[PDB]
Amino acid sequence: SEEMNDQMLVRRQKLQELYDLGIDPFGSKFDRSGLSSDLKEEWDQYSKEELVEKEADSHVAIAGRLMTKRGKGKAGFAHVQDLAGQIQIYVRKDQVGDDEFDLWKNADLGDIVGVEGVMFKTNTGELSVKAKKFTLLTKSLRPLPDKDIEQRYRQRYLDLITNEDSTRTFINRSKIIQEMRNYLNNKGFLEVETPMMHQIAGGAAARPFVTHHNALDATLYMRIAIELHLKRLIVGGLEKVYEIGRVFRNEGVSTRHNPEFTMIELYEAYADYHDIMDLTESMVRHIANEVLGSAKVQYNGETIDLESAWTRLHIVDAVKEATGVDFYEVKSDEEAKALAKEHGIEIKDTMKYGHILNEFFEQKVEETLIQPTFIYGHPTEISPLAKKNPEDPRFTDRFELFIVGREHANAFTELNDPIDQKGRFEAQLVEKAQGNDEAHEMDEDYIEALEYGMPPTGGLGIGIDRLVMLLTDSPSIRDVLLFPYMRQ
Amino acid sequence: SEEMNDQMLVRRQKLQELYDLGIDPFGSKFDRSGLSSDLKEEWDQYSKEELVEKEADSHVAIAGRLMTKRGKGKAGFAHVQDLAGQIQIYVRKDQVGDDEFDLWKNADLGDIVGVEGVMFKTNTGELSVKAKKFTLLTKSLRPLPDKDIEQRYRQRYLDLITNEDSTRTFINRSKIIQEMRNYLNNKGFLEVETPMMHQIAGGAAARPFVTHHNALDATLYMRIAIELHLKRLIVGGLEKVYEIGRVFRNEGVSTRHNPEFTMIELYEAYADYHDIMDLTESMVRHIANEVLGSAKVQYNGETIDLESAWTRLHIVDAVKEATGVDFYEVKSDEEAKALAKEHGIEIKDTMKYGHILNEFFEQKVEETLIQPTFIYGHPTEISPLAKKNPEDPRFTDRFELFIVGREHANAFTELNDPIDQKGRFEAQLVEKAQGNDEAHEMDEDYIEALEYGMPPTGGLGIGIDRLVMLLTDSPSIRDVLLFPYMRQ
Ligand SMILES: N[C@@H](CCCC[NH3+])C(=O)O
Ligand SMILES: N[C@@H](CCCC[NH3+])C(=O)O
């Protein structure tokens, strides 16, 4: 724009003027007595007349961004924004002196300023700081935008200045994650760090990001999951371990998806998937109560009840409820393919009984699960790391947590049998050769670890970003990431 | 080996025998009353005779790995290892019954077992569990190795079972990191997450790992630092932010280096590098006192004194002390190159005054800094993101922390001037074109962020793995990583 270029030229002139006046226009350190909220908590109780008597005791020092400005004469007003919010400042020439009032006149919207002064109230009752000393801490060379929908994601720093609701989401994200640590640390779980660069990327059904080590001439994959390294630590005897960190998945383009995202994975020796259900339900309920004050949370104008007991439903029973098809009584792959055609379930011809049952669930059931629901009993074909159910080997002791129509957690009784696990890994190569590009690879070192003996173990994975979305009432993953991935 | 293959065949026979006996040889969930240390804390005070009277009150349930075994008759002993340590078990046929004693006979070293029983002591005074119920929880198909130096790194799970000192290092690593969070959270710092996949990898002098997004046909770089995204949050008004996470550097091969490692980066608005010195010194001293009980720590048989005041030394004065060369009085690049030849300092012909001063420091001084030393005043040529010193523009307001002869932290008064920062970025392209492959790229979005106005800011980066090495008395980075990078 022509107007935008003229504003930036004026700001460059004003920068040079500050150099001519003999100050550092990008500032030195600045001591502060408090934030705007501390000033309001301590002084807003008192009236205009009471504050005049307390001027000897109300000396403060604040700093922040100039958001409003008025007064072309010898007295002027402005709103200064810091982390907590805004506070009005009052700058008189007869208070700050001639040299500092030239800096006040130079100052424009967006500049960082420091103010030392005393508290007072205007005739309208607005708590303000009467400046005794004014400091221009940083000259901004570019003005803020006033009144592009993608700018808040591409330039998050502008969103954090202009939108207070955005800042609250990220503060609550930090509290949610820290409350998860505190909960698990109090129960005896050890936080660990495992490699993000894997020789073989396993632990999930997803396409990896590939990279190259130059000095070694070696191919490395960014991790798609934290699973396989954490189960090695269970073989090593650590018993209770977890890890909160980034995973990377090279999947298709979507507003619902991000190439990198934060996961917690957790493993407890001598537990099963029912113990993990209890832990997941208790932990999420606890985090909601501590951060929000209630486990009944609003999501898109609807009350999601995490306080009351969460529903537990077998995937076969969920599909039967929705479609009338009872997959217990389906006896072959051909019968499943026939039923898939009848009920309009999009499938691939390579799919079997278990794959098709899952498509019934994903296409007809999944989205209806608004209240927190543990869907369990996932078929063996889609569950390569989960132990089989003893009473019915078609299904595994696995669950997925569904809230607001989407997956929030994945968990199972772990497969500690290295013979079966070798067999699962072999069957995933059959799928990979015939057109399933996001299938499990052959990790020989992992099988070797299981052969030394892994105890019976319960494992859990929670998508942290989706949990944060739920508890902050955010419609998209781009609202809970500070710098979400944007095209170009 | 032939013997190793025979052992594994015997274990497969024993696995099949357990299936024939009608148990699950890979186990179900197992409730425990405590760890071996809880049993010792509660019961080891009492004598053999006192424990017999308390058998009604001393029912316990434990589980762990079978590490020793003796007794071929109807009574046998074994040591069971859990997270805390080992406890002896005593299994009699007349206590557990015939069916469970067959499982005891089947059990071999490395198997996971569950024992429910009562406390007692042997004639030698060893606290033990007299088994009332024995459970074989997992059959191990491969025996542990007895009495290859790289096996502890390649197979960490074996090291954690056999070496108790290794387990303590990783528990203390977790405490060190959590104590850092607690310290910073109490001072008002916000923990955040920023992208690990960058469009342009900046924030340090290092070669990046390159990768490709398939669905978008876009090139992405794994982050070499956390710096540039965190300073955007300071522009956004968050004031106090930090991030503990992985960075990735595609550098040469070494035992001292790992391709991925953990960093904390921290940024405080309205602070300078002297405030960051105070913070770094206070924080590290605090973490040492809380985790170890003292800030005087042993490293390779030598007392490193973090309790007393840390030394502060200008890089020019450090070089003058070591070599006699005063770089304040060196007036040109040719004089610096001449002095470099005289004192045997390996340099490149493209290097200037500042580059050469640093080589003097790295080759003659660095390794001698055993006690904690803030080296400051780094020259502008090697400090592209640091603000210049006002009194002497040759040097920046930067420091590096040196302990036990190596770098532990990097910090500076941040360059919030977008005109100068553009100029630094332009001068790094001059170095990149003439043979400096680990130089800074041209981030236009970052410059645009600074133009909206960044306040005066102090920034800090600490290598977490090196800090953990110091405080755990570990000689190599591979000793403080659970799964360090190994060739092949
Ligand atoms: N690796 C799983 C999470 C853990 C599942 C239970 N072991 C995932 O990415 O979905
Ligand atoms: N990006 C720096 C750490 C922060 C330096 C101070 N801003 C590094 O990797 O060394």
Swiss-Prot record, chains A, B:
PROSITE patterns: AA_TRNA_LIGASE_II. GO terms for biological process: lysyl-tRNA aminoacylation. CDD domains: LysRS_core, LysRS_N. Its EC number is 6.1.1.6. The keyword Ligase applies. Keywords: Aminoacyl-tRNA synthetase, ATP-binding, Cytoplasm, Ligase, Magnesium, Metal-binding, Nucleotide-binding, Protein biosynthesis. Its cofactor is Mg(2+). Mg(2+) 2 binds at residue 407. Mg(2+) 1 binds at residues 400, 407. Binds 3 Mg(2+) ions per subunit. One of its GO terms (cellular component) is cytosol. Homodimer. Belongs to the class-II aminoacyl-tRNA synthetase family. This is Lysine--tRNA ligase. The lineage of its organism: Bacteria, Bacillati, Bacillota, Bacilli, Bacillales.
